[PDB]
Design a binder for this molecule. Structure first.
Ligand code: NI
Length: 341
């Protein structure tokens, strides 16, 4: 059954709850963003109102084939009424189209559900500055102090220089970027841009990117592999045998692959800076794992929560075991006592 942390008290609203069949008493299904753990269960046959960003709407319509009459896109940063209840959608700094949702309850409670987010100080000067928030439904993916990672800007800087140098040293080297979902487009876009190329990809991935209101996108991507020296591939295929394979298919147009695996956290975050990264090499094929996160570090999360000073926090990630739950509750208490709310 749909868990309590997917229900918004005193509404008939649910968030990211599509895989439980009809939820008894739900009048409106919110979707924070187009990732499959969140949309799981959506399809052309769903016949209940879905509320979401314009971008997420474009993806429901063109990739899942949900019928237009059920998609209610809302602009961001705009006070809107949904079945008699004031709501605001805010940028979640996660993947394209991803949102946080502010709920103003008829009783006077204000609730924020973060969906998936990467907390940023820029959120402190949005519509959230303007009033008190009583309840926080929090993306707790990296709620533990070992989880450090660099800024997105640091990581992109590294990837750009790495690729530019390898391609200038050898003009017959190919760049491959792994992907399996929306998000992290800046990786392959910044690389392509420094090398004077469009990015090449399959037809299914091209369709997905054409939904995302990226400015000047027709100038940046293509379905023509031959014409492009940055290739996107399924993340599954980013390994030595699967690259070699791919390298055969290019027909002697390239002799070397330089490949990037945009991971989240991996344990060498605890010992190594971005400046001192190295790849796995098997011949002319090299694979960088780069820690580009679209989830809050432990410190970024801490800061956002200490600024907000919510009265109650309800975790939406890592809730399945009593030990995770217990550990999270301890950090929330430390934060509260340190900050005096
Ligand atoms: Ni996500």
């Amino acid at each position: 059954t749909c868990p309590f942390y997917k229900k918004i008290p005193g509404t008939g609203f649910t968030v990211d709850a599509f895989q439980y069949g009809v939820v008894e008493g739900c009048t409106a299904y919110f979707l924070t963003h187009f990732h499959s753990d969140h949309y799981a269960g959506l399809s052309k046959h769903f016949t209940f109102p879905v509320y979401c960003s314009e971008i997420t709407g474009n993806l429901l319509k063109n990739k899942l084939h949900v019928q237009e009459q059920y998609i209610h896109p809302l602009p961001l940063d705009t006070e809107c009424i949904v079945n008699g209840v004031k709501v605001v959608l805010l940028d979640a700094n996660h993947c394209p189209g991803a949102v946080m949702i502010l709920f103003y309850l008829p009783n006077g409670t204000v609730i924020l559900h973060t969906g998936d987010f990467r907390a940023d100080p820029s959120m402190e000067r949005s519509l959230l500055a303007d009033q008190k928030v009583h309840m926080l439904y929090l993306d707790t993916t990296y709620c533990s102090p070992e989880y450090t990672f660099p800024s997105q800007q640091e990581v992109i800087r590294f990837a750009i220089n790495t690729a530019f140098e390898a391609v200038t040293l050898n003009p017959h080297a190919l760049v491959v970027c792994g992907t399996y979902s929306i998000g992290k487009e800046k990786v392959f876009l910044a690389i392509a841009d420094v090398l004077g190329s469009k990015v090449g990809m399959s037809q299914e991935k091209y369709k997905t990117l054409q939904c995302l209101n990226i400015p000047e996108i027709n100038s940046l991507i293509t379905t023509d592999m031959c014409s492009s020296l940055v290739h996107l591939l399924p993340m599954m295929q980013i390994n030595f045998k699967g690259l070699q394979s791919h390298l055969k298919k290019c027909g002697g147009k390239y002799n070397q692959i330089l490949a990037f695996r945009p991971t989240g956290w991996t344990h060498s975050n605890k010992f190594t800076r971005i400046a001192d990264v190295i790849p796995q090499t098997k011949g002319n094929i090299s694979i960088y794992g780069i820690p580009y996160s679209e989830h809050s570090s432990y410190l970024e999360m801490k800061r956002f929560v200490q600024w907000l000073k919510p009265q109650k926090i309800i975790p939406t990630v890592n809730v399945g075991t009593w030990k995770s739950r217990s550990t999270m509750e301890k950090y929330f208490r430390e934060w509260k006592l340190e900050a005096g709310y």
